[PDB]
Nucleic acid binder design. Structure first.
Ligand SMILES: *O[C@H]1CCO[C@@H]1COP(=O)(O)OP(=O)(O)OC[C@H]1O[C@@H](n2cnc3c(N)ncnc32)[C@H](O)[C@@H]1O
Ligand code: NA
Ligand code: NA
Length: 326
DNA sequence: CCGACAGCGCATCAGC
DNA sequence: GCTGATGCGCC
């Protein structure tokens, strides 16, 4: 399917999703609307009625009702009303700033702070994350083409290896799945001297990337997880590159390949792989693969030395990251 | 009828 | 000072 099919419907549910998350603070309704929007997006027919829709998993009576009103009128009275509501539309908007969630956004709107402009002139009321969110607002909503992503990886792999050539680093996410575009860059990191039963391995890497001016800002940083901002170097006499979000995780060697598997995704793959792994009598999380004893008692973590090792535990042939779409 | 719906690292806040 | 809750972004 393409947008033309049911796009009007999926954008409707998407709008509703966002209002529930950001304004109503109903994360479960947010996820329900998204489930609905997603499954309709894959459905290869121009839907004709709510009842047709209701046959799909995740679409219930309420969405089938909404689809009917939209089909017959071309709009939803609720969305129309919401869209015109200064308070709600402003609360929703502010959440686009990284670090401003629905609670901060409601607080800001409670006190008259409604726009980026109001944020700009109210710097003191923003934490560190939010200020970086604000500063990079437009940059953070841009996608990252694969070629820039390839250039970003070049930099990360070169500099990590310079710090210690025994580091293992893997750019995961959709990029590793061969996506043509990316939302950010997620880098998983491990070192032989770091296992489950075992200095500042992560700080040393972050610092090197800051030394060559690849990492430009820090959103959060501890011993195992770094979240921040990076930027490719502008070619001599040429427009700067956008600033990009990058996350760096330090994982123990023995849970590294579980981490790669998990953070490569995508979600559908993990959910199905975990599902099938349950049928086959193991449990897989982000960190481990544990077998289930006769009743339901998960034993200790199994030895994993590669992504394939975990496939080779649950009788699956190693699927490539290219086809871990579902 | 009613609860699950993922849960974790980190920054910052509420409260002692 | 400290500890725990809360908010946030994230497959
Ligand atoms: O989220 C709903 C689905 C599961 O439980 C709730 C409530 O269901 P209902 O009591 O059957 O319906 P309702 O509370 O009226 O609808 C909830 C949302 O939809 C809007 N809405 C208000 N009134 C209606 C009616 N009569 N029909 C459809 N939708 C309606 C509300 O603004 C709510 O957000
Ligand atoms: Na359904
Ligand atoms: Na945000």
């Amino acid at each position: 399917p393409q947008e033309t099919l049911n796009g009007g419907i999926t954008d409707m549910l998407t709008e509703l999703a966002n209002f529930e998350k950001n304004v109503s603070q109903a994360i479960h309704k947010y996820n329900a609307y998204r489930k609905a929007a997603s499954v309709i997006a894959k459905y290869p027919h121009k839907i004709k009625s709510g009842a047709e829709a209701k046959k799909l998993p995740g679409v219930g009576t309420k969405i089938a009702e909404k689809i009917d009103e939209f089909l017959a009128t071309g709009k939803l009275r609720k969305l129309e009303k919401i869209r015109q509501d200064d308070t709600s539309s402003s609360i929703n908007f502010l959440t686009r700033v990284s670090g401003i969630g629905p609670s901060a956004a409601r607080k800001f709107v409670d006190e008259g702070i409604k726009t980026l402009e109001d944020l700009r002139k109210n710097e003191d009321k923003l934490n560190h994350h939010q200020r970086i969110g604000l500063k990079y607002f437009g940059d953070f909503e841009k996608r990252i083409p694969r070629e820039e992503m390839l250039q970003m990886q070049d930099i990360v792999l070169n500099e990590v290896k310079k710090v210690d050539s025994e580091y293992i680093a893997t750019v995961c996410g959709s990029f590793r799945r061969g996506a043509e575009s990316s939302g950010d860059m997620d880098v998983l990191l491990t070192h032989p001297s770091f296992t489950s039963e075992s200095p500042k391995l992560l700080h040393q890497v972050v610092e090197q990337l800051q030394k060559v001016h690849f990492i430009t800002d820090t959103l959060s940083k501890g011993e195992t997880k770094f979240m921040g901002v990076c930027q490719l170097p502008s070619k001599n006499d040429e427009k700067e590159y956008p600033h990009r979000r990058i996350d760096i995780r330090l994982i123990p060697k023995d849970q590294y390949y579980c981490g790669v598997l998990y953070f490569t995704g995508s979600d559908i793959f993990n959910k199905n792989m975990r599902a099938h792994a349950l049928e086959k009598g193991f449990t897989i999380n982000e960190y481990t693969i544990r077998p289930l004893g006769v009743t339901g008692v998960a034993g200790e973590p199994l030895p994993v030395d590669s992504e394939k090792d975990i496939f080779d535990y649950i009788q699956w042939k190693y699927r490539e990251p290219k086809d871990r779409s579902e």
